[PDB]
Paper text:
[name] is a pyruvoyl-dependent enzyme that catalyzes formation of decarboxylated AdoMet, a substrate required for biosynthesis of the polyamine spermidine from putrescine. The [name] pyruvoyl group plays a key role in the catalytic mechanism and derives from an autocatalytic processing reaction that cleaves the peptide backbone into β- and α-chains.
TbAdoMetDC/prozyme wild-type heterodimer was crystallized with putrescine both in the absence (apo-TbAdoMetDC/prozyme) and presence (CGP-TbAdoMetDC/prozyme) of CGP 40215 (CGP), a known [name] inhibitor. Crystals (space group P21) from both conditions diffracted to 2.4 Å. Two TbAdoMetDC/prozyme heterodimers are observed per asymmetric unit. They are associated in a tetrameric structure formed partially through a domain swap involving prozyme β-strands (β0’), but which buries a relatively small surface area. The TbAdoMetDC/prozyme complex was previously shown to be a dimer in solution by analytical ultracentrifugation, thus the tetramer is unlikely to be relevant to its catalytic function. In prozyme, the electron density is consistent with a bound putrescine (Put’); however, in TbAdoMetDC the corresponding electron density is larger and the crystallization buffer bis-tris propane (B3P) was modeled into the site. Strands β9-β16 form a scaffold that extends across the dimer interface with H-bond interactions formed between β15 from TbAdoMetDC (R336-E340) and β15’ from prozyme (R305-H309).
Numbering used by the authors:
A (entry chain B): 86 to 357
B (entry chain A): 5 to 23, 27 to 85
C (entry chain F): 3 to 24, 33 to 207, 219 to 238, 243 to 286, 291 to 324
The structure:
């Protein structure tokens, strides 16, 4: 995958072995032409399921760190969660000379072991862009609920399997990518929607995939709706009470840069 | 390799069974400042030609495009 | 750099992974064991504890015996043993991971069940420094720890390129409602980098409760306590430590156990917050951490 270009930022999401960092020089150039100034860069990825197959600087977190340091020497890396299990790698750089107002929001989900009755619909012997055939898939699987009629959307059904969808409404976006293969089943979800509580959003995605385990990370800005709620003892939608079929295995909280926080939680299905 | 990536690999091996595609994604985000002389449209002033060259740098390509008064959305494939 | 695909086997164990696929820039290592049941203070002898530490290149030099506390002072490490836990803190030149398995075997020979364990190291540099052996040691530490506790996991709290703590945690605590194993521990750690103008001390006012202070080489001081009274006024004792030592950087770790006795103090005197964070373990307990630098 996904690329989101906004008035003030770029968001590039890639999977597989795409060497994502090779496009940084061109993004810096895209900001210079319009006479902008880079002030905030983040690179993030859930721990790779097969790190030995990654290429370029992505074969090791040290090399991702080395690469990003060559371009942003002040940036800082982090690792949230168990290093030999579900965790996130983050590299953050900022040159904020003008104290601004941060009211953005970012919600990401990584889901493994997807529902087998659902994977049947993420298969296809022919390529299919956004058309009547993918509409059937959205209704048959439940994506119609996550991406209702108020959203502009374009999606792609892959061959032999695979599915991607983008959705935009106003300044909000929403994306999903699915790897249906049983032995390496995975699905991702990300959105920037403003919401005092993410419980219904998350549950809507869980009902589609009902995964054996999933992680959720939440970036909280100080001046956002969720930020005001979080910084006053309010619940934000990732608390264990909202997921009774799941057990929280580890949770992290970090103020990676002043005033900005990140929450991450790993959930595993109890499997009675 | 480094000790931390060594730990990460052992966790991926224990959950690995040859019977594989990388689902977990990489995310890059760049936010820019706005100076007096900045284009009033920001990065949206660029046409799709600009962003297509970006995707070529990573050996990928656009498949479909949807725009908006606020966002440009592109779906990509290897 | 050229790179090709080598179709190689998967290591059957962590040890094979370290040797086949894989100057210490730390400042202290810490190894802790807790037991499913309180252990008699005198069943594990000083002789047996000293032999375990000989596997880590340490020789016993002094030992005292107080109410509920046995203290063993080595060349570069300090060992405390109460009915509830064994804790050893050592300098970085001590291969403290080589005492993990022998220590566990010692417990096994005494019918002592270890249900919780941790290995911790405070780093000033990064493990990604290829000119330092820091990464090869951490790999070995992970080999013994994961070998001994396959269910344990490592974590890294704080910026990987700044002051931070890398620790391994194994949680085998029985939490069945019928279990009498309670979790109301107090653990407060203060690491003070570059203090102004060497020793290993222990002080205790109650039984089984202690304060330990280590000072050694760049100078640094390491303070720890498990006294329940300390968890009621942490903001006071840290300020007393900063005045006494006056460091450039500080790293605090505070344990909030399942039965909470606790967020890090938001502000410290003449210090700015570099990083703040917390690790909420599934068992219900939390490890809070914050790093500071002189303003």
């Amino acid at each position: 995958x996904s690329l989101f270009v906004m008035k003030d930022r770029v968001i590039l999401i890639t999977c597989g072995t795409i060497t994502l960092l090779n496009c940084v020089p061109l993004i810096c150039e895209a900001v210079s032409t319009v006479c902008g100034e880079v002030e905030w860069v983040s690179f993030m990825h859930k721990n790779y399921s097969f790190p030995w197959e990654q290429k370029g600087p992505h074969l090791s977190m040290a090399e991702e760190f080395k690469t990003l340091r060559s371009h942003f020497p002040s940036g800082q890396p982090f690792i949230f969660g168990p290093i030999d299990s579900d965790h996130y790698f983050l590299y953050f750089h900022s040159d904020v000379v003008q104290p601004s107002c941060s009211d953005d929001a970012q919600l990401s989900m990584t889901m493994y072991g997807l529902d087998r009755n659902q994977t049947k619909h993420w298969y296809s012997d022919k390529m299919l862009p956004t058309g009547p055939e993918t509409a059937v898939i959205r209704e048959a699987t439940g994506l119609s609920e996550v991406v209702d009629d108020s959203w502009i959307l374009h999606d792609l059904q892959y061959e032999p399997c695979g599915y991607s969808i983008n959705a935009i409404r106003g300044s909000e976006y929403q994306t999903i990518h699915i790897t249906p293969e049983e032995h390496c089943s995975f699905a991702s979800y990300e959105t920037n929607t403003c919401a005092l509580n993410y419980s219904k959003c998350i549950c809507g995605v869980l009902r589609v995939f009902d995964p054996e385990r999933f992680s959720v990370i939440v970036f909280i800005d100080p001046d956002s709706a969720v930020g005001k709620s979080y910084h006053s003892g309010g619940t934000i939608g990732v608390e264990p009470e909202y997921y009774p079929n799941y057990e929280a295995h580890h949770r992290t909280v970090n103020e990676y840069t002043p005033g900005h926080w990140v929450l991450k939680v790993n959930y595993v299905k109890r499997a009675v | 390799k480094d000790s931390l990536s060594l730990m990460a690999m052992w966790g991926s091996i224990a959950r690995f069974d040859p019977k594989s595609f990388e689902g977990p994604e990489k995310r890059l985000e760049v936010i820019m400042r706005v100076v007096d002389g900045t284009h009033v449209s920001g990065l949206l002033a660029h046409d799709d030609d600009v962003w297509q060259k970006v995707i070529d740098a990573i050996c990928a390509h656009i498949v479909s495009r949807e725009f908006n008064e606020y966002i440009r959305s592109y779906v990509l494939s290897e | 750099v050229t790179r090709i695909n080598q179709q190689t086997e998967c290591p059957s164990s962590v040890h094979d992974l370290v040797s086949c696929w894989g100057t210490d820039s730390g400042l202290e290592k810490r190894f802790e064991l807790n037991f499913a049941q309180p252990v008699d203070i005198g069943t594990v002898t000083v002789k047996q504890l000293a032999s375990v530490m000989e596997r880590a290149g340490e020789s016993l030099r002094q030992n005292s015996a107080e109410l509920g506390i046995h203290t063993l002072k080595f060349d570069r490490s300090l060992l405390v043993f109460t009915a509830k836990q064994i804790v050893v803190r050592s300098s970085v030149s001590v291969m403290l991971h080589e005492a993990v398995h022998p220590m566990l075997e010692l417990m096994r020979s005494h019918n002592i069940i270890v249900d919780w364990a941790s290995f911790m190291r405070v780093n000033y540099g990064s493990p990604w420094d290829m000119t330092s052996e820091t990464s090869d040691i951490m790999a070995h530490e992970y080999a013994e720890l994961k070998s001994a506790f396959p269910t344990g996991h490592p974590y890294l709290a704080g910026p990987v390129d700044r002051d931070h703590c890398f620790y391994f945690v194994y949680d085998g605590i029985d939490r069945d409602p019928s279990s009498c194993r309670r979790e109301n521990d107090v653990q407060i750690n203060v690491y003070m980098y570059n203090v102004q103008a060497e020793q290993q001390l222990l002080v205790s006012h109650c039984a089984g409760e202690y304060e330990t202070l280590r000072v050694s080489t760049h100078p640094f001081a390491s303070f720890e306590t498990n006294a329940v009274s300390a968890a009621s006024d942490i903001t006071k004792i840290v300020n007393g430590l900063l005045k006494k030592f006056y460091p450039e950087r500080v790293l605090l770790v505070l344990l909030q156990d399942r039965d909470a006795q606790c967020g890090v103090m938001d502000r410290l005197e003449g210090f700015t917050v570099v990083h703040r964070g917390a690790n909420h373990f599934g068992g219900g307990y939390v490890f809070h951490q914050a790093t500071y630098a002189r303003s």
